[PDB]
Amino acid sequence: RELDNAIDFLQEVDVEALFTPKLSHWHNRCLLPDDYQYDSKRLLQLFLKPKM
Amino acid sequence: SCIQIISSSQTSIAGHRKLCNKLFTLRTQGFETDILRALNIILTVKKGNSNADRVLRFLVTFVNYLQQKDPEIDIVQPILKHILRGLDAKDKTVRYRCCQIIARVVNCVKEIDDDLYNTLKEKLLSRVLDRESIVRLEAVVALSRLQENDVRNILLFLLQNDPSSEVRRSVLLNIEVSNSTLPFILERARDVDAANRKCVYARVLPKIGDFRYLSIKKRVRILKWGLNDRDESVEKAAADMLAYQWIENADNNLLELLERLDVSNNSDVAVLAIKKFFDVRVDSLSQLEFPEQFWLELTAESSLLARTFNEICIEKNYTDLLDKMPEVVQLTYYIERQYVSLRDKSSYDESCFIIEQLLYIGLSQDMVDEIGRRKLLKSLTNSLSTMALPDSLISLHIELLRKLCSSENDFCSLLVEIITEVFEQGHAFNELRCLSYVQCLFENITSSLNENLYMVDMLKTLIIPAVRSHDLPIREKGLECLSLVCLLNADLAFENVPLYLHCYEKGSVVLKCTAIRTLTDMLIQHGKAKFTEYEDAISSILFEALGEFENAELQTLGAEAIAKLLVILHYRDELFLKPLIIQYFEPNTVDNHALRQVLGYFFPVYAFGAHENQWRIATIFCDALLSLLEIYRDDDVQLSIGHIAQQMLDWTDNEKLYERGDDYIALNHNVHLHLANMIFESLPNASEGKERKFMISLLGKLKIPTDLPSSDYQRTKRKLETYESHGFTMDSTSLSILAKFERMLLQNEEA
């Protein structure tokens, strides 16, 4: 490809150096809001005469 | 050489088989060493490199190619021993590559030495809690190769709480599927990320052989979420699972599938499932046949299918398909056969559901057939006069009666005759059935013209006697009937406001809910100006209701009433907008999810509907937010307030209007620049500390356009200066925000 990435596998590398030796935000536990239950049509309907 | 073969796999994947053979010529040697040397150079490349994956793809490819054949060479154990050393490293990519490699290589075979098993497990369990998201992603994939408890419980934990969607998806795609793990993967069907939701239907559920393994309430909860999903792709994946896999487990028999959904108790979901099935499989819709036999052996599922099929064809305008539905003459006959089944209790619940479906089909017809119109009217006139239908079917019967009558007047005449005959019989259960007929009567008319006499009759004969009854159920039913009559006459509505106020203060919760609905509907129906004498009394009960976090149902009702009074009537928006926002964000109401659902829908609709609604919110913004600060000090306080404030700021952002004639938008003042002025005027009343600090923090989040008139920027700077003249002591960040804001004003004046 035009975009050479590109890797030279003959370079010198120092294994020990690379190998030289948790994180508490972690609420709203990634789920959508409850919004599918309310039938939006209810708002403009009368409480007592829904099929108005 | 051996290393350059690998360096050649860098570019493409096609030649991998070719290079596998040549490299398979150098097995008998610095073989092992040269590969680890190639991998040591894969740890240096940062993520995002197409190569590193290609090279790594070539290696996993060669390993497998090697086990078949000449398994004598065990290279998976050395390679894993060499690379596990790097699980503890400081280059996040050395950790990410190590996990990346281990995940793929171990997958090449199962037989591992136990000591290699334990060590890998111990180090990986600590990794899945890595500080970087990329490491966690590849770690669970690696760790998931040693599944089977402690192993499992950790994956549930990340799947459930990991802040990264890609990580959750990786856990979602490799965790074991069992009743222990099942509840958590289904929760992901409501994941915030659409791709994660789609994965549950597209990949994870198919792994379960049969949908019957799930509990009936699980099957329904799945379809309810999937088929109603907001994302077009997730919704499509759920419909495909339903229409190609689940139908298969039911022997390709739609009825047999319906019988596994308990449609009588899950009607709404069952209808949607049928409609979505035929959106995917339109070919099948033309293959349904409804012979006479079909209607004489109706079931709950069989009857629901016909009502939905009829519902689809009408919406889709499949006229030729509608010719398969029966004429009203046959329909009246089919309904009357089903009445017989009501006498036997063993088939009572199912027949009620079947009759319900047939009435829905009847309500859909536009019957020019006078003959059949008259027949069905007779049947309905008879069933209401002689039988004892349940409250569920009474409404549909009286609703269908209205549809057949030529006008409201004939409907009142007829239904009053029926009510009188049923009333003569009884002279408890009888009176409650009568009032139920009265209730449905006034539910199906819209004006009081030409029916004064019918009203005065129902009032004198039934409603007022019921309202005065000492029997609690009759009194409650009588009030609901009285309310519906008030919706037909404004003067009668006004005359009875005092009663419904007396119902709220001295009445039970059920009676309080009746007052809220009645007074709210009288305002919407008859108008705001008619009841201005009772404006404070009605607003009072609306406030009191909204503050009763003890009664989720009553509280949710007050909140809902206020919401519609604002949108429909603009009923004292300023006065209610602040109590609404406070309660909506108040901690004592957080558990009331019903309330947060109605206001979750109202605020965007109200705020984004009109520029004037955003202005009203900015006018009480500061006072609402300050009240919430005091409430909140009494887990994390500062973090939640920030989200609240950003919500209120989005509501007031002019850019977020839905938008739809206004020649004079010209000198409309910006709500956010107006909000800045509000903040400057409220900072003195704030208490120095986070409070005054926090209110200043908002000036930096405001979205001030740069094309406003200069006098607008000049006016806000005057507000800025008035606050500065107080000489309050401010920290560095506060002073920096104020200085950056003050210079923004100057710059926008200049342009």
Author numbering:
A (entry chain C): 477 to 497, 503 to 504, 507 to 509, 512 to 537
B (entry chain A): 2 to 30, 32 to 150, 157 to 435, 491 to 697, 701 to 726, 731 to 821
Question: Which text from the study accompanies this structure?
Answer:
Condensin protein complexes coordinate the formation of mitotic chromosomes and thereby ensure the successful segregation of replicated genomes. Here, we identify a direct DNA-binding site in the eukaryotic condensin complex, which is formed by its Ycg1Cnd3 HEAT-repeat and Brn1Cnd2 kleisin subunits. A peptide loop of the kleisin subunit encircles the bound DNA and, like a safety belt, prevents its dissociation. Firm closure of the kleisin loop around DNA is essential for the association of condensin complexes with chromosomes and their DNA-stimulated ATPase activity.
To gain detailed insight into the nature of the DNA binding site, we solved crystal structures of the Ycg1–Brn1 subcomplex of Saccharomyces cerevisiae (Sc) and of the homologous Cnd3–Cnd2 subcomplex of Schizosaccharomyces pombe (Sp) to 2.8 Å and 2.6 Å resolution, respectively. One of the two molecules in the asymmetric unit of the Ycg1–Brn1 and Cnd3–Cnd2 crystals shows additional electron density for a segment that corresponds to a long helix (α1) in the N-terminal region of the kleisin subunit. This helix and the succeeding well-ordered turn stack onto HEAT motifs 16 and 17 and onto the α4 segment of the kleisin via several highly conserved aromatic residues in a manner that resembles a “latch” that has been inserted into a “buckle”. Through the interaction of latch and buckle regions, the kleisin subunit adopts a loop configuration. The absence of density for the latch segment in half of the complexes suggests that the α2 to α4 segments of the kleisin subunit are sufficient for complex formation with the HEAT-repeat subunit.
